[PDB]
């Protein structure tokens, strides 16, 4: 409804906005399509411009900044003067800037604070993930390093954390959204899919590092059969770490719902805890599309499958 | 569709490079700070050696 840019208000030009995020996505993504007459052409929107989308929030019905990022790419058509943007929050910067860091044994929160301090990234008070990580040397992107240590934190019994940018970097635990919205009331169509596609019933740990930690921790072998994996990570250097990694991998296969909603719940985001029918599910992916009729589509799943796949 | 192929090939190189990192023999030099391995930004202050290198 309001698109601030730097100074102007280009909400008087946009054909539609689509706010999309994935649980493992690089960044909260806003793809706003505009018509580009002389008026919009004058201001000369370039890549790197700062877009802030403001719309009436679902919670309190007050205008709140639902998106605050930067224009990552502009594509302009000439025959039809339709300028199209693809906005990203500043976690896209972290996913592109490579750097090598050597880390001793420590927790994920300390590592994230170290990254932010090194690269001068503003950040709120980061939640203590608690889990203690093994010494590693990293080379991938900063977001890649953060995701790697968060995955290793999900292993060893730690809670599932996800990093979202907003104005200043936030360490967002998955099941900690304020409002557990119920989608059954506006359920245009749902697609309950169940499978054994990524089911894990057994896991045979073969430790590449010593405390000779080896074991098997089959959990539902009698019911679904011995759907076995082999976890052979150097980071597992402990018997309890092996047991917790095994326990953080068992699941009954893929179990998700491809939900389609006729009303756009504005504040939904990846990782949020949302209800369909009596059950509760975590948002694997959300794709708003703020056309003339607000609309939302969701892909949600159980905790076990999400932990198995994305962690 | 060539853009998808190029992006996917970039992903091939990315994944292969990440997998090959931290593996295989590498050259190095000893310093007062500690071991200095070629291709590493920081010196390794804790490392192992073969026992035949510990001779008086």
């Amino acid at each position: 409804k309001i698109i601030l840019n730097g100074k102007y208000d280009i909400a008087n030009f946009n054909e539609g906005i689509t706010l999309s995020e994935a649980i493992d996505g690089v960044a909260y993504k806003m793809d706003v399509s505009l018509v580009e007459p002389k008026q919009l052409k004058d201001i000369n929107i370039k890549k790197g411009d700062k877009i802030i989308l403001i719309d009436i929030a679902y919670e309190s019905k007050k205008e709140e900044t639902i998106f605050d990022g930067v224009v990552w790419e502009t594509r302009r058509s000439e025959k039809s003067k339709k300028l199209t943007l693809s906005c990203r929050e500043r976690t896209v910067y972290m996913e592109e800037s490579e750097e090598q860091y050597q880390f001793k044994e420590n927790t994920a929160t300390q590592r994230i604070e170290y990254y932010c301090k090194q690269w001068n990234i503003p950040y709120y008070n980061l939640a203590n993930t608690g889990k203690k990580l093994a010494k590693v040397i990293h080379k991938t992107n900063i977001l890649d390093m953060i995701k790697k240590d968060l995955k290793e934190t999900a292993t060893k019994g730690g809670d599932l954390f996800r990093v979202r940018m907003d104005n200043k970097l936030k360490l967002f635990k998955l099941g900690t959204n304020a409002n557990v919205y119920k989608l059954d009331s506006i359920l245009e169509d749902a697609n309950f899919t169940s499978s054994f596609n990524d089911a894990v019933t057994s896991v045979k740990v073969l430790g590449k590092s010593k405390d000779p930690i080896i074991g098997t921790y089959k959990k539902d072998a009698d019911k679904f059969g011995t759907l076995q994996k082999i976890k052979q990570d150097e980071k597992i250097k402990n018997a309890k770490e092996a047991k917790k990694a095994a326990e953080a991998m068992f699941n009954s296969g893929e179990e998700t719902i491809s939900v389609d909603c006729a009303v756009d719940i504005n504040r939904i985001r990846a990782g949020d805890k949302v209800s369909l029918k009596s059950k509760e599910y975590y948002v694997i992916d959300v794709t708003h599309t703020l056309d003339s009729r607000p609309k939302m589509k969701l892909n949600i799943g159980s905790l076990e499958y999400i932990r198995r796949k994305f962690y | 569709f060539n853009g998808i192929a190029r992006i996917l090939k970039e992903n091939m190189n990315k994944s292969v490079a990440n997998g090959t990192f931290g593996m295989g023999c590498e050259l190095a030099e000893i310093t007062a700070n500690g071991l200095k391995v070629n291709g590493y930004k920081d010196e390794i202050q804790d490392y192992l050696v073969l026992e035949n290198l510990t001779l008086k």
Binding site: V26, K29 | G3, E10
Partner: peptide
């Protein structure tokens, strides 16, 4: 009658490229 092919080839290319860039 024929522009559907161009439109939806563009949609397929955009969607797959978009997904690869996001997840990758």
């Amino acid at each position: 009658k024929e522009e559907m092919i161009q439109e939806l080839l563009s949609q397929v290319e955009s969607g797959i490229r978009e997904a690869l860039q996001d997840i990758g």
